A paper describes a structure:
The N-oligosaccharyl transfer is catalyzed by an integral membrane enzyme, oligosaccharyltransferase ([name]). Oligosaccharyltransferase ([name]) catalyzes oligosaccharide transfer to the Asn residue in the N-glycosylation sequon, Asn-X-Ser/Thr, where Pro is strictly excluded at position X. Considering the unique structural properties of proline, this exclusion may not be surprising, but the structural basis for the rejection of Pro residues should be explained explicitly. The archaeal and eubacterial OSTs are also single-subunit enzymes. The N-terminal transmembrane (TM) region of the Stt3/[name]/PglB proteins consists of 13 TM helices and contains two DXD motifs on the first and second external loops (EL1 and EL2) and a TIXE/SVSE motif on the fifth external loop (EL5).
Here, we determined the crystal structure of the ternary complex of the [name] [name] protein (AfAglB) with a sequon peptide and a dolichol-phosphate molecule. To stop the transfer reaction, the Asn residue in the sequon was replaced by a L-2,4-diaminobutyrate (Dab) residue. The acceptor peptide was tethered to the AfAglB protein via an engineered disulfide bond. Even though the tethered peptide contained the non-reactive Dab residue at position 0, the LLO binding site was occupied by a dolichol-phosphate, instead of an intact LLO, suggesting that the LLO was hydrolyzed during the prolonged crystallization period. The N-terminal half (residues 335-350) of the EL5 loop is disordered when the LLO binding site is vacant and becomes ordered to form an α-helix in the presence of dolichol-phosphate. The carboxylate group of Glu360 in the TIXE motif (Thr-Ile-Ala-Glu) indirectly participates in the coordination to the metal ion through two of the three water molecules. The sequon part, Dab-Val-Thr, plus the Ala residue at position +3 in the acceptor peptide, adopts an extended conformation and lies side-by-side in an antiparallel manner with the 4-residue TIXE motif, Thr-Ile-Ala-Glu, in the C-terminal half of the EL5 loop. Two inter-chain hydrogen bonds are formed between the carbonyl oxygen of Thr357 and the amide group of Ala+3, and between the carbonyl oxygen of Val+1 and the amide group of Ala359. All residues in the sequon sequence and the TIXE motif have ϕ values in the range from −60° to −120°, except for Val+1 in the sequon, which has a high ϕ value around −150°. The rigid ring structure of the side chain does not allow Pro to adopt such a high ϕ value and thereby excludes Pro from position +1 in the N-glycosylation sequon.
Residue numbers in the entry:
A (entry chain A): 6 to 872
B (entry chain B): 1 to 9
The structure:
């Protein structure tokens, strides 16, 4: 037929269409809903940078005073993705808002499809032409962090890391292949010079997408180092390999130069002159390898008298010297050697991040190959066989590209071991080496013959071997696509309760029009951010867990205290004010210390921070992880007697009982700010009032069609019914049920000792509080009382109501309470009763103006009897 | 889906 020299493009097109179905069509209904949902968190910060860059085109900010309030943080996100989305938005006339997000959602998907090309190139320039076709197909179905970070809506720079790293290695090894065996006058032609120039541009674009992309230079230097010290071992045109590297690194340094001075110091992620020195310094190291080979060529190592081994040895001594004599700038070493800390994380606080946890390990510290299936499918094991075979073949053929690919493979495996995120780097590794595996078997099992016997050839073809070549193609491709089809059917991002709450914040908190204007200003790059930023108008901060910082800035257009850059977390052990030391504050006086230092005016708390994410906040605040279970106790159990019990230790739980897989928090938890805010609805606090709460968790919103959420008994039976139903399958109860179970445990363990109850009802997913000076209600009191209590009923915008209590002790025959709610406020969460203030046997009722709450007015209210 | 967020929820 016509597929002659042309099937290889027929598979690439089919591979691209499979990639489109997984990346664009599968998560389509998850990205395009009630709004355009960019996935995760970081795609929302790129969206922030892009609509600012579009407004100030062609200029770009390198420091953001919005996030990390009130200090601002330097922007490490690369100019590649920022300028790509910015130009893409202008071409489609989408400069902000939902229309801009719809354009940005396709960029990660297109990068995932386009990755077929650099994977083909790298595989062809190392192995053969058939294997490059398998690798292109396999990279179209590999799941895990590669597929999820290249899906529709996940406009992050991780796909462009993988795209440009593989592009750099392919173009570099293509340049070495086009240059080897030729003299310099031939390699100096424009046709030959184009190959290392292209390789240098791909390296520059790699760094321009990721400040830590300079790591490609020591990897390429590792190619030359091992090719030199093994001159009799490996067979490589070392002189032309050195010259390709010189041109490649010089061009890359020129590409990086115009972006090199946007950080006031050396940095490995921020766009600083450190990366410029790594690229420029790599060019002179490659130029030093030029002399060592030019000296070995003439025979300089035998005239001095060291032997053929001398040339390897002088490389080793200079590898030690040329680094040792680079003490001319010790900050360079400190940042260069800093890479070894990247794959290690004894921080513990950092461990609580979902993307950083080490591969091959459970949250119990035991080896596992379970993520290898969930992230690569069969390609991992098919990839190891291709790696081991490549090592076997390298020891026989001694091809240099096969050696460099192995070095790349082993370096990416160490990074994969460190953090599970770097699976987006190892994805192209298993796809390339499984292609090497499947290509070996397809030739030895006569499938390459039967394919050409199918049209226009004659071969001795064993259908028994062909049937098995088809059967292991099954095993490599089918279970891999199964996981990719499932994982691509949903996309992450904020839920409606988070989005609705944040849009409400943007339109119902003061200065929304000033924040909107300041959101698009081209901020100057400061020399330091250790002092609070000098804002052009009176700003305020919004404190929450660091997960939601980008959502706060991009959706609410408000300045968050903490962000997904793990900035603004703070801790308690050092009294560093931040998110953790605020939400784990054990009394309101300490939380006011943290809030005042950070100029906090608003608090956003969700049910996640209340339940399953509270453990991380105690880990950050305390630093030590075993020092964090102090906030936790035992478990609930459904015993064979048909009753529900509670035990401190697992041994106290009776046999045949059914253990709700939910660790009930300790008494210390219920005294912290997160409990007082979300689980007690702000009761007991004098400087905070609830102003807005979102809808319920979806499960309980569904439950309310047949459950009376004003009936504590009906809620309790429903929560206990669900918890057992899901404990039967070893699954935790839903979040809305975890909150109800948390409230039930407080009433059965720590309530009777105090007298302040909590309604067993559920509540809204996201809750917003405003920081208040507070109306000071002070007055005289009778002769023999030591305590004064305040009572008021609050009703939220979801028609849910709760009690606000506060108790103070009498001193000098006088009480003083500070009240955060008012009775003429504009907020959708209002009190429906006056304040009932009790002083022993004397009761009085008071209503408070909003002006007295804002300005902290003192009100005299005596509760005294003669007696 | 593990991304730049707190885990186990
Ligand atoms: C050892 C390696 C480890 C890599 C993995 C790792 C520990 C870290 C990298 C992880 C990674 C992918 C990225 C981290 C980058 C950084 C700094 C930060 C990232 C922050 C975060 C991820 C991003 C946050 O932002 P977000 O993305 O969330 O928005 C590298 C590969 C090199 C090898 C020699 C391994 C080969 C394997 C084997 C089995 C043989 C070993 C045998 C041996 C006998 C040992 C051999 C010993 C040697 C020293 C030879 C090395 C040669 C060469 C490199 C030296 C030349 C000059 C160098 C110094 C650079 C010069 C630069 C300047 C000065 C010009
Ligand atoms: C290289 C850059 C790629 C640019 C591609 C952008 C082109 C078209 C985007 C529009 C896709 C349709 C989305 C849609 O149905 O919107 C309807 C409601 O917004 C649903 O929320
Ligand atoms: C002298 C060096 C100056 C370098 C200036 C580069 C600055 C920003 C790079 C972003 C521009 C987009 C590049 C582009 O469209 O090509 C990439 C694929 O072809 C399309 O996905
Ligand atoms: C062919 C060569 C195969 C090499 C296989 C090595 C596998 C894993 C190496 C990663 C070690 C990283 C450091 C580590 O274990 O933990 C560091 C703590 O954080 C120290 O506190
Ligand atoms: C009433 C007497 C008690 C004294 C303790 C003070 C406690 C809290 C005062 C907080 C005042 C709110 C100010 C705020 O959050 O924003 C600061 C920007 O001016 C924007 O409002
Ligand atoms: Mn990210």
């Amino acid at each position: 037929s016509w597929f002659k020299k042309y099937w290889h493009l027929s598979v690439l097109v089919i591979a691209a269409l499979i990639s489109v179905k997984l990346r664009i069509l599968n998560p389509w209904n998850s990205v395009f809903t009630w709004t355009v949902r960019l996935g995760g968190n970081d795609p929302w910060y790129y969206y922030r940078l892009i609509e600012n860059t579009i407004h100030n085109f062609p200029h770009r900010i390198w420091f953001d005073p919005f996030t990390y309030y009130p200090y601002g943080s330097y922007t490490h996100f690369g100019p590649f993705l920022v300028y790509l989305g910015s130009i893409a938005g202008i071409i489609f006339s989408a400069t902000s808002g939902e229309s801009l997000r719809a354009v940005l959602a396709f960029i990660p998907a297109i990068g995932g499809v386009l990755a077929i090309l650099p994977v083909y190139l790298l595989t062809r320039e190392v192995f053969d032409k058939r294997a490059a076709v398998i690798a292109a197909f396999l990279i179209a179905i590999v799941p895990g962090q590669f597929l999820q970070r290249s899906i529709l809506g996940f406009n992050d720079h991780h796909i462009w890391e993988a795209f440009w790293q593989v592009s750099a290695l392919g173009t570099f090894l293509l340049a070495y292949n086009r240059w080897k065996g030729h003299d310099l006058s031939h390699n100096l032609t424009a046709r030959q010079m184009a190959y290392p120039v292209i390789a240098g541009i791909t390296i520059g674009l790699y760094v321009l997408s990721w400040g830590a992309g300079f790591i490609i230079a020591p990897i390429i230097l590792a190619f030359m180092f091992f090719a030199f010290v093994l001159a009799g071992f490996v067979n490589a045109d070392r002189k032309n390999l050195s010259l390709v590297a010189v041109v490649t690194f010089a061009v890359s340094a020129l590409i990086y130069l115009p972006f090199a001075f946007n950080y006031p110091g050396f940095s490995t992620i921020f766009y600083s002159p450190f990366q410029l020195l790594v690229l420029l310094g790599s060019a002179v190291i490659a130029a030093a390898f030029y002399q060592i080979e030019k000296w070995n060529d003439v025979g300089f190592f035998e005239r001095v008298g060291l032997g053929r081994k001398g040339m390897p040895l002088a490389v080793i001594v200079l590898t030690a010297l040329i680094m040792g004599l680079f003490f001319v700038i010790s900050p360079d070493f400190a940042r260069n050697l800093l890479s070894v800390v990247r794959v290690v994380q004894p921080k513990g606080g950092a461990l609580t991040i979902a993307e950083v946890y080490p591969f091959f390990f459970t949250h119990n510290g035991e080896f596992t190959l379970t993520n290898a299936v969930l992230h690569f499918g069969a390609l991992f094991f098919f990839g190891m066989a291709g790696i081991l075979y490549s090592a076997y073949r390298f020891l026989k053929r001694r091809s240099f590209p096969e050696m460099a690919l192995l070095i790349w493979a082993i370096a990416m495996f160490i990074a994969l071991w460190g953090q599970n995120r770097f699976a987006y780097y190892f994805a192209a590794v298993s796809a390339v080496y499984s292609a090497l595996a499947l290509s070996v078997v397809f030739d030895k099992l006569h499938l390459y013959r039967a394919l050409e016997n199918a049209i226009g050839a004659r071969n001795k073809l064993s259908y028994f071997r062909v049937a098995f070549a088809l059967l292991i193609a099954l095993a490599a491709i089918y279970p891999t696509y199964i996981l990719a089809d499932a994982q691509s059917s949903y996309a992450g991002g904020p839920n409606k309760q988070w989005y609705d709450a944040l849009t409400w914040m943007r339109e119902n908190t003061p200065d929304g029009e000033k924040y909107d204007e300041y959101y698009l200003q081209l901020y100057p790059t400061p020399q330091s951010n250790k002092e609070p930023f000098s804002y052009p108008f009176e700003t305020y901060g919004v404190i929450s867990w660091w997960d939601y910082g980008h959502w706060i800035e991009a959706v609410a257009h408000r300045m968050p205290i903490a962000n997904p850059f793990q900035a603004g977390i703070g801790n308690k052990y050092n009294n560093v004010p931040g998110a953790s030391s605020f939400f784990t504050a054990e009394n309101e006086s300490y939380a006011e210390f943290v809030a005042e230092k950070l100029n906090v005016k608003y608090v956003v708390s969700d049910i996640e921070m209340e339940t399953c994410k509270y453990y991380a906040m105690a880990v950050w605040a305390e630093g030590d992880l075993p020092l964090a279970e102090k906030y936790y106790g035992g478990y609930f159990y459904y015993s064979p007697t048909g009753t529900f019990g509670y035990a401190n230790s697992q041994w106290d739980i009776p046999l045949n009982s059914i253990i709700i897989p939910l660790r009930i928090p300790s008494e210390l938890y219920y005294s912290t700010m997160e409990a007082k805010l979300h689980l007690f609805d702000g009761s007991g606090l004098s400087h905070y009032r609830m102003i807005y709460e979102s809808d319920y968790p979806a499960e309980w919103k569904s439950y309310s069609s047949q459950v009376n959420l004003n009936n504590e008994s009906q809620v309790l039976q429903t929560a206990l019914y669900e918890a057992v139903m899901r404990a039967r399958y070893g699954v935790s109860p839903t979040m809305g049920t975890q909150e109800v179970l948390y409230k039930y445990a407080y009433t059965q363990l720590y309530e009777k000792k105090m007298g302040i109850p909590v309604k067993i009802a559920p509540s809204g997913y996201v809750k917003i509080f405003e920081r208040v000076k507070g109306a000071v209600v002070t007055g005289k009191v009778s002769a023999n009382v030591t305590e004064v209590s305040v009572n008021a009923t609050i009703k939220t915008n979801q028609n849910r109501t709760f009690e606000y209590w506060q108790t103070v002790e009498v001193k000098n025959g006088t009480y003083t309470v500070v009240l955060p709610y008012s009775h003429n406020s504009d907020y959708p969460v209002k009190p429906i009763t006056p304040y009932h203030i009790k002083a022993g046997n004397v009761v009085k009722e008071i209503t408070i103006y909003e002006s007295q709450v804002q300005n902290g007015e003192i009100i005299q209210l005596d509760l005294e009897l003669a007696l | 889906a593990p991304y730049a967020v707190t885990a186990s929820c």
